[PDB]
Scaffold this active site. Sequence first.
Site, PDB file in Angstrom:
ATOM      1  N   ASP B  10      18.833 -15.234 171.824  1.00 28.94           N
ATOM      2  CA  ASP B  10      17.801 -16.136 171.340  1.00 28.94           C
ATOM      3  C   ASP B  10      16.525 -15.359 171.037  1.00 28.94           C
ATOM      4  O   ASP B  10      16.257 -14.325 171.660  1.00 28.94           O
ATOM      5  CB  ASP B  10      17.546 -17.223 172.396  1.00 28.94           C
ATOM      6  N   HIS B  27      17.076 -12.755 161.279  1.00 26.70           N
ATOM      7  CA  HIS B  27      18.530 -12.826 161.281  1.00 26.70           C
ATOM      8  C   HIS B  27      19.138 -11.444 161.090  1.00 26.70           C
ATOM      9  O   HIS B  27      20.006 -11.030 161.857  1.00 26.70           O
ATOM     10  CB  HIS B  27      19.006 -13.776 160.179  1.00 26.70           C
ATOM     11  N   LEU B 112      37.851  -3.790 174.928  1.00 24.61           N
ATOM     12  CA  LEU B 112      36.964  -4.927 175.155  1.00 24.61           C
ATOM     13  C   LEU B 112      37.404  -6.189 174.411  1.00 24.61           C
ATOM     14  O   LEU B 112      37.774  -6.133 173.239  1.00 24.61           O
ATOM     15  CB  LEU B 112      35.545  -4.588 174.694  1.00 24.61           C
TER      16      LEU B 112
END
Lengths: 222, 219
Positions: B10, B27, B112
């Site tokens: 955020d 962004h 991962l």
Amino acid sequence: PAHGCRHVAIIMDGNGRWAKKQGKIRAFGHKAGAKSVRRAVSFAANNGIEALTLYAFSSPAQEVSALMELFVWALDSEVKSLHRHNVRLRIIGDTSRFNSRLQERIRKSEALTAGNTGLTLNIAANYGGRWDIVQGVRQLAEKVQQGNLQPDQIDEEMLNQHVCMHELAPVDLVIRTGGEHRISNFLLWQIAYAELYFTDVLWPDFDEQDFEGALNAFANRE
Amino acid sequence: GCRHVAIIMDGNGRWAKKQGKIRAFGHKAGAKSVRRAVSFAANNGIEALTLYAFSSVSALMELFVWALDSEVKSLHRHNVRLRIIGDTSRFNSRLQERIRKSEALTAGNTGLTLNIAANYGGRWDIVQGVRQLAEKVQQGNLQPDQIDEEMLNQHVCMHELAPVDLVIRTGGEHRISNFLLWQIAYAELYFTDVLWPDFDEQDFEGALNAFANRERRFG
Ligand SMILES: O=P(O)(O)C(O)(Cc1cccc(-c2cccc(NS(=O)(=O)c3cccc(S(=O)(=O)Nc4cccc(-c5cccc(CC(O)(P(=O)(O)O)P(=O)(O)O)c5)c4)c3)c2)c1)P(=O)(O)O
């Protein structure tokens, strides 16, 4: 109301550490903790808070049966005072495996205070966030089995109606004293949008000024 | 030993304004921060990384397709297993197919596992699992008072992965915002005011250090 905080949930922790620091035994910390519990309840009732939910955090299966005995016995005495201060008492948690006696006391304690117009106090006893969600799921499961609820008809709002404290204002603020930064399977579903406040202050030292700080932090956050 | 980190990214928009730039700039910078966090996790033995983009709608999907088309081959090469969690039933068939193909291609990787929460919600997650258990009840292959925690756990997202150990939320907000709920019952929660575009390797390690110290303490 100024703080805009309607429902506060608190994970009380640090009583043992508090007592240890003073070279004192558990009983001393527990005694100090209970005092802090009364102080927090009184503060909430005198500060326009609609609901206070308390969870005693503790780091067996024979011990629990003994703890709930202490719990209920302590409750019987506290209820008088709570009722006197116009508080509505509710016990949340898996009380199913409690003997019918101490299980009736709880029931009567709740019935006795249900009509009060002050603070609504929820005390967690043998409570689990996942358990809370599950018992709500079983309810919906019963209705599916009885033929008047389609599996695909189940949505969030429906399940929300079956979790503890659904009738109350959503939890706005969760406070955890003691330094640990985790929910520890306390409320889960109910804290989806709550503000989370962690403080290193040990429960016995958490007073009115600390509670006010948490509310002020909450009000300024948005 | 931190095995599974979940992140509430955020602060992209706020970051953009602080630089006196347009949203699109935040962004772009946020995207670089994602690539950096994934690389860091993949380079440090972290078993799983779950990413959730917090927001203060058709084109959104085209961007998703583009990100999948340009990044999946690299993820595959890095032995990363990609998974999208959330309600993708509303997505157009093209995006759903890209997601399905991307997961298929990397499913066999052993490195991962990167979980990207798309149109995901913690309550939705729980509910979708409840609906699966409700179906078996209706079929009569399950009794209501037979449903327990372990059973529901086996029907929530990521139940096949290690439990979430640490939840990091950047941007200064101190809430879970309906991200993971069931999965974070015992997770360490870490909040930082650092804006997502600025969250780097040092900030990530700091959270991991905090996790380690807090593990020694409290247990
Ligand atoms: O994690 P801690 O250190 O903060 C802890 O002190 C536990 C704890 C955390 C947060 C709050 C409280 C607490 C303490 C006193 C009163 C209240 N008020 S209550 O309405 O919430 C409540 C009342 C009765 C029982 C419970 S409980 O069953 O939900 N929790 C609980 C857990 C562990 C210990 C106790 C406990 C409480 C009071 C007295 C005792 C007993 C004795 O320990 P003691 O005489 O030495 O004090 P004991 O009879 O064996 O000798 C034990 C109680 C809760 C709450 C207790 P811990 O060392 O016990 O794990």
